[PDB]
Design an enzyme around this catalytic site. Structure first.
Site, PDB file in Angstrom:
ATOM      1  N   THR A  11       3.879  -5.827  -3.938  1.00 23.93           N
ATOM      2  CA  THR A  11       5.072  -5.974  -4.798  1.00 23.93           C
ATOM      3  C   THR A  11       6.332  -5.645  -3.971  1.00 23.93           C
ATOM      4  O   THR A  11       7.399  -6.263  -4.196  1.00 23.93           O
ATOM      5  CB  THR A  11       4.888  -5.035  -5.994  1.00 23.93           C
ATOM      6  OG1 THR A  11       3.650  -5.382  -6.650  1.00 23.93           O
ATOM      7  CG2 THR A  11       6.081  -5.091  -6.920  1.00 23.93           C
ATOM      8  N   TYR A  29       5.993 -11.027 -11.366  1.00 18.17           N
ATOM      9  CA  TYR A  29       6.511 -11.402 -10.027  1.00 18.17           C
ATOM     10  C   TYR A  29       5.366 -12.014  -9.202  1.00 18.17           C
ATOM     11  O   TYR A  29       4.172 -11.966  -9.611  1.00 18.17           O
ATOM     12  CB  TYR A  29       7.087 -10.184  -9.303  1.00 18.17           C
ATOM     13  CG  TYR A  29       6.142  -9.012  -9.363  1.00 18.17           C
ATOM     14  CD1 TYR A  29       5.046  -8.929  -8.520  1.00 18.17           C
ATOM     15  CD2 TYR A  29       6.296  -8.044 -10.336  1.00 18.17           C
ATOM     16  CE1 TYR A  29       4.118  -7.914  -8.649  1.00 18.17           C
ATOM     17  CE2 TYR A  29       5.389  -7.000 -10.470  1.00 18.17           C
ATOM     18  CZ  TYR A  29       4.285  -6.953  -9.642  1.00 18.17           C
ATOM     19  OH  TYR A  29       3.395  -5.936  -9.786  1.00 18.17           O
ATOM     20  N   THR A  40       0.477  -1.846  -4.646  1.00 15.43           N
ATOM     21  CA  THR A  40       0.103  -0.587  -5.315  1.00 15.43           C
ATOM     22  C   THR A  40      -1.314  -0.593  -5.829  1.00 15.43           C
ATOM     23  O   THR A  40      -1.851   0.489  -5.977  1.00 15.43           O
ATOM     24  CB  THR A  40       1.099  -0.252  -6.441  1.00 15.43           C
ATOM     25  OG1 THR A  40       1.131  -1.339  -7.342  1.00 15.43           O
ATOM     26  CG2 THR A  40       2.483  -0.009  -5.878  1.00 15.43           C
ATOM     27  N   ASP A  41      -1.919  -1.724  -6.092  1.00 13.76           N
ATOM     28  CA  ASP A  41      -3.206  -1.716  -6.828  1.00 13.76           C
ATOM     29  C   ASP A  41      -4.297  -1.010  -6.035  1.00 13.76           C
ATOM     30  O   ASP A  41      -5.032  -0.266  -6.648  1.00 13.76           O
ATOM     31  CB  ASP A  41      -3.627  -3.162  -7.072  1.00 13.76           C
ATOM     32  CG  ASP A  41      -2.983  -3.775  -8.296  1.00 13.76           C
ATOM     33  OD1 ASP A  41      -1.907  -3.303  -8.722  1.00 13.76           O
ATOM     34  OD2 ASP A  41      -3.709  -4.571  -8.927  1.00 13.76           O
ATOM     35  N   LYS A  72      -3.226   5.518  -8.507  1.00 11.70           N
ATOM     36  CA  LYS A  72      -2.375   4.765  -9.466  1.00 11.70           C
ATOM     37  C   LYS A  72      -2.896   5.089 -10.867  1.00 11.70           C
ATOM     38  O   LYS A  72      -3.961   4.611 -11.219  1.00 11.70           O
ATOM     39  CB  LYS A  72      -2.437   3.284  -9.133  1.00 11.70           C
ATOM     40  CG  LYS A  72      -1.508   2.471  -9.964  1.00 11.70           C
ATOM     41  CD  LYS A  72      -1.411   1.039  -9.501  1.00 11.70           C
ATOM     42  CE  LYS A  72      -0.367   0.308 -10.306  1.00 11.70           C
ATOM     43  NZ  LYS A  72      -0.130  -1.042  -9.740  1.00 11.70           N
ATOM     44  N   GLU A 113     -25.053  17.452 -15.388  1.00 11.63           N
ATOM     45  CA  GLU A 113     -25.469  16.391 -16.347  1.00 11.63           C
ATOM     46  C   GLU A 113     -26.763  15.720 -15.917  1.00 11.63           C
ATOM     47  O   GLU A 113     -27.414  15.124 -16.771  1.00 11.63           O
ATOM     48  CB  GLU A 113     -24.399  15.303 -16.466  1.00 11.63           C
ATOM     49  CG  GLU A 113     -23.269  15.783 -17.325  1.00 11.63           C
ATOM     50  CD  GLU A 113     -23.630  15.805 -18.795  1.00 11.63           C
ATOM     51  OE1 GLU A 113     -24.729  15.234 -19.148  1.00 11.63           O
ATOM     52  OE2 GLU A 113     -22.829  16.389 -19.569  1.00 11.63           O
TER      53      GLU A 113
END
EC number: 3.5.1.38
Lengths: 330, 330, 330, 330
Positions: free
Chosen positions: B13, B27, B93-94, B166, B287
């Site tokens: 981006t 975008y 950013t992803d 993120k 767990e």
């Protein structure tokens, strides 16, 4: 005159036991019957007329669609009874958020429905379950709770069952919403600061009374170097919708887009959610051309929530424009 | 004399463009070359001697292992150059968080390495990319950044590349850590408040210079009514480890445990992570019986981070006790 | 057919200027007139018919009750005009939360009222004011904003003017509420997730049209070794109420209780707030015997918010029971 | 085999009692003596050799400088003893953060010092104090705690005594830091993720062994329409420094600046803090000309922390430049 509250027990840590008082994190779930949970909090008698039913006795990480239908149908029968004022469901925390959203969509009642668990077993030092159960019964017995949709009462908070999620491991403040708690419950009293905006319960187009089966919906994860393998395998084994737990704003790898296009043509709904779960939402037509591909964005809903909404929605429609409206209204 | 900083551009981006100034969220990524990015921030010449290289031009949702290695090897070559003081990588950013953690594990240098992106494209009103890149150059040129491991400089913060993620869509405060920001960067100056505790960079036992290709590792999600299908399909198509993104404390459905036992018996590493990513960690033997099953817990690492550490770790060891040590030290 | 929106400018960082593009934190506030702000966002023409008025030109840390009243009276005049569909107020961030709560209590209109600022001046790299002002105008022109009370639209969020507060210094995500954002604004569009629960605007018992001047109310801080000195001095110079910004749950030092009892006996209202402002509320009769002393608790309202509500409440009543009701309804 | 841990009791909710089990928020503090506190947690004997001393029995909202000095000197005496490995201080939550920072500045030992409280009294349903005290003793007995500075162990977290603050009322997650927890404590074991960056304990220039008195320091609040009254009164009544709890970035009203200039000329230190306490810091020379006025900024420290650092610092210096250095290093 005290409210008539019914506690529907399903298992979980709240019904669990550890070897010693310092075992807050290592324990066996779903050991104590509902009558022992109720007798464990004698102050319940001060705030409501309580009775318990054992619906099931499971660790919630192993919950099935059949369990959800059985619980939904028993909640509907109790809500239709003149002898019931409110309903509390004791639940394991792992999938509490899924059950709470399910009931928020399919229970057409304004009677309070409260889902509650604990992060520590009742055997542990400073166990949270006693006060969480007390708070759940207090909220289920409060006129302020009517019409608010399904609520979750952990950590002294009143959270919406729509968008509360298990966000923090280990700690008692596990359950958070991007949109905040709606209130708090302190010394039996409810204090409200926000109202729900989304469709729920009495204003829902869905009704558990008309649902005898749920469509199979599965979830695949997005990450660096992901391939189309999990997406194709899940559909080949019966998924009617795939929830894509994408990076960022529901983003899809160029390695995976062609598979999702083939799957959508073959009738699998493609719903773009994300693993970006603290805030924001997935915007239609931003990272992918959802109109061109006839895909759906999950809005603010995390993958496991989006699965719940998709399954309930697909009892009524397979029109991707109707599914998108549903993901924008609920 | 100014520090010599090299900007390695990979796309994203921060290099993106929308139709209008009001397009902060819709975008096209990876449109602008590195020399245009640098020219967009003429104030860089005040804080460092900057030059740029175009390593790749991708939307980070489509990043591959080949891309990671190409970037990692170029970073290594520059870190070894007496002519380079610091390195900035511009990135979508992803998957920024995956690359940042990868570099933190495999770059045996104390020279600052900063990864930076933007939540808005540079064409948008109030675009965040210009000050994020300025801040990245400032931090990469600061003696205080030496030996701190890989850093991420968005939202005026200094975040650890290890555990920043993120976590919020759309907003410029997207990148968060469960363990807080380590510092802030304001008007070109760095202000520190915490130091890293985990192994990184010069103290890492891993080195990009010996890695020719990474092991295939995949991620399957846990949710209500999940089956073993994704797990078996991912292993059948080459996965050497599976990251289980479980409910709660890395919990595993009773429908899935037998498949994971059989996969571990057949040589596939089983790493328990979670989609509970705001705080806490996954506790060994709580767990599931990890010792009995020869499984590994991912500690506090989210699924995509756990995949990166598993890939790097498996270049050195197939011993599940060694993997568990690495998940507790890095 | 676009909404008519009036922007009322009062100064602040959004109207500020720094020496250079890298001056995001060191600037002069209140330099630019409202017409330059408007002309700085030519995209406003796409979403509304906008005009500007300069009400005042101040740094908001120096706002007076005279300034609040002047702005409140001009907001009332505009709300009463058939030619105005919505109102935007550009404001310094320091006391924005005070002004926003004040207008929420006294403006008896369902027309949208939005208060907006910026954390960086418009001269800075990656200045936030342009998109914040665009978002404010988008929200003030949106039918969804009618009846929602005063809104604050920074950082892509729709925050309630009641309980949003400046909680983070420096960063653009400065404004937070304990009860979450109500919505988000993205690419001009408003997405709602919560509704207000407290009394405001059209349902308020207060009306700016009857207020000629506000009562003097001051704030004193609680901390280790605090004395009664600030409390007595503020009362001796006119205070009609004192907001106690206590430790914890509005707690009062044994060294201060006698002074506050004497001040209440002499006609000064005593309102227990706290400097514990991220969540929870001050509970009546918990830390102090408020019934016995005829004191008031400020509920969830921080000191500066509690001052605003006390000033408005005291234009109607001197009865401490009525003041407590008001602190529980607004 | 086991560490020798001394518990110093000072009072607080952890030693409190309520009327019923559902009184989590309405109780009397400082009722139970240290030997009952310890007997209430029989599991302490598993993790340490513990003994108790009653240092004082107070509600911490009423703590004095004389109390801090007595506790600080007792801690020094125990730290200097070969028969003490670690120290736990039981404390009311209201000023816990002040005591924890004070001991962080003045105790020149690398022996673990832990301060702990509870948000619910030990009589309450799901009381937090038992596990909080177990964890404090676990952390005080852990080799990993050595050299880390003063720690606070509530809500399963290891928080720095420097910058942890009581930020949320009512709930057990009350204690938060802008810079994150440094670790967690679970089933007696400590898991670290960050280290301190600031000066503390063995690297402090300050020592309780050379401090027999503390300069008087007071705090005034900033808000709309604030006047100079509280500042002047506090200085007239012996304040040697004033902590200004400003709006925003330590901003000062134009109606208060001239008083603070006259007070600085009269020798009163002026320290700019803020009521903006969730993140960021107060920047020198930004909102006020600190160099021209010879004022100090409190950096990230909230007003009550800033008071503690000023009081300690002014045992050694009244040079504003040295105080500013101290506000940038501690």
């Amino acid at each position: 005159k005290l409210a008539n509250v019914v506690i529907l027990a399903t298992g979980g840590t709240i019904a669990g036991a550890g070897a010693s008082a310092a075992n807050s994190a290592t324990y066996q779930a779903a050991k104590l019957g509902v009558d022992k949970l109720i007798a464990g909090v004698p102050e319940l008698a001060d705030i409501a007329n309580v009775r318990g039913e054992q619906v099931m006795q499971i660790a919630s990480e192993s919950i099935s669609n059949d369990d959800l239908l059985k619980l939904g149908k028993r909640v509907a029968e109790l809500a239709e009874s003149k002898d019931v004022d409110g309903i509390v469901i004791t639940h394991g925390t792992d999938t509490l958020e899924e059950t709470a959203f399910f009931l928020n969509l399919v229970e057409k009642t304004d009677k309070p429905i409260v889902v509650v668990g604990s992060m520590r077993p009742g055997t542990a030092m400073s166990a949270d379950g006693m006060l969480n159960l007390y708070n759940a019964v207090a909220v289920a017995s409060d006129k302020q709770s009517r019409g608010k949709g399904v609520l979750v009462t952990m950590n002294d908070e009143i959270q919406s069952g729509r968008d509360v999620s298990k966000a923090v491991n280990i700690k008692t403040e596990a359950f958070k919403s991007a949109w905040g708690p709606m209130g708090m419950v302190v010394e039996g009293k409810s204090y409200w600061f926000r109202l729900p905006a989304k469709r729920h319960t009495v204003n829902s187009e869905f009704d558990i009374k008309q649902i005898s089966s749920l469509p199979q919906v599965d979830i695949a994860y997005g990450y660096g170097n992901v391939t189309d393998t999990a997406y194709k395998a899940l559909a080949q084994n019966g998924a009617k919708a795939l929830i894509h737990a994408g990076t960022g704003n529901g983003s899809v790898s160029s390695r995976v887009v062609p598979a999702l296009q083939e799957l959508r043509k073959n009738g699998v709904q493609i719903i773009r959610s994300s693993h970006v779960n603290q805030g924001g939402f997935v915007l239609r037509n931003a990272e992918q051309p959802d109109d061109k591909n006839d895909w759906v964005v999950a809005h603010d809903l995390n993958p496991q929530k989006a699965r719940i909404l998709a399954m309930v929605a697909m009892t009524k429609t397979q029109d991707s424009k109707e599914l998108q409206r549903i993901f924008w209204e609920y």
